[PDB]
């Protein structure tokens, strides 16, 4: 059987959520993407041999800690944590959408990884180091990314699937 992973895309708004999204769904750069659209997206690919099929959502909602709300982002297996490398305070949220999922799939341990960005800009605000040093502190990976030439898309992606083989062995 092909397995499937459920994948969730979270960050502040504008971080590039959608067009990280779309650049492995489409393989092309989409820099206009409507703000509030909250979908999901499939596509098979090849990680390490294995055929796999994933379930990305990218989220987009209104904040909202509600039963409703709490169970959809429950269906993730693991998280992206997107910030944007020119956004302070993209990378200063960080710390709220680690808690809200650990909070929400009950667990100390749930595959995770950190995507700085926006990485073909020369305006960067947050340097590489502080960044490899939180995914540090919460002992997860760090990838940096940019969805307009594809630099890390695939390695954000398959890492978190990696992730999640290894949290279900
Ligand atoms: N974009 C804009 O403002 N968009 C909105 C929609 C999403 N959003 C937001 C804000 C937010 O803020 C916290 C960092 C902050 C801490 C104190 C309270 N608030 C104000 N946090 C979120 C958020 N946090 O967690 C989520 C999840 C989707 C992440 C996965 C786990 C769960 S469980 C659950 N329930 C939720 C939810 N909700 C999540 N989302 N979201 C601000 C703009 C762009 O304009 C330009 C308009 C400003
Ligand atoms: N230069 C650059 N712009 C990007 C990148 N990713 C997204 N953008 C831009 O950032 C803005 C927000 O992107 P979007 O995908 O809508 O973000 P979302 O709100 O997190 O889904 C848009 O103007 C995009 O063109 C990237 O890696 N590089
Ligand atoms: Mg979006």
Redesign the pocket.
């Given at each position: 059987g092909m397995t499937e992973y459920k994948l969730?895309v979270?960050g502040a708004?504008?971080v590039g959520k959608s067009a990280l999204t779309i650049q492995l769904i489409q393989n092309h750069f989409v820099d206009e993407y409507d703000?509030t659209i909250e979908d999901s997206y499939r596509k098979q690919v090849v990680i390490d041999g294995e055929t796999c099929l994933l379930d990305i959502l990218d989220?987009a909602?209104?904040?909202?800690?509600s039963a409703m709300?709490?169970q959809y982002?429950r269906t993730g297996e693991g998280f992206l944590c997107v910030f944007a490398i020119n956004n302070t305070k993209s990378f200063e949220?960080i710390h709220?959408?680690r808690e809200?999922?650990k909070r929400?799939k009950d667990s100390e341990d749930v595959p995770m990884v950190l995507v700085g960005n926006k990485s073909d800009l020369p305006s960067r605000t947050v340097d590489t180091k502080q960044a490899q040093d939180l995914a540090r502190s919460y002992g997860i990976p760090f990838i940096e990314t940019s969805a307009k030439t594809r630099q890390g898309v695939d390695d954000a992606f398959y890492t978190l699937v990696r992730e999640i083989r290894k949290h279900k062995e």
């Open positions: 969730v979270v708004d504008g703000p989220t909602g209104q904040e909202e800690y709300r709490d982002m949220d709220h959408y809200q999922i929400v």
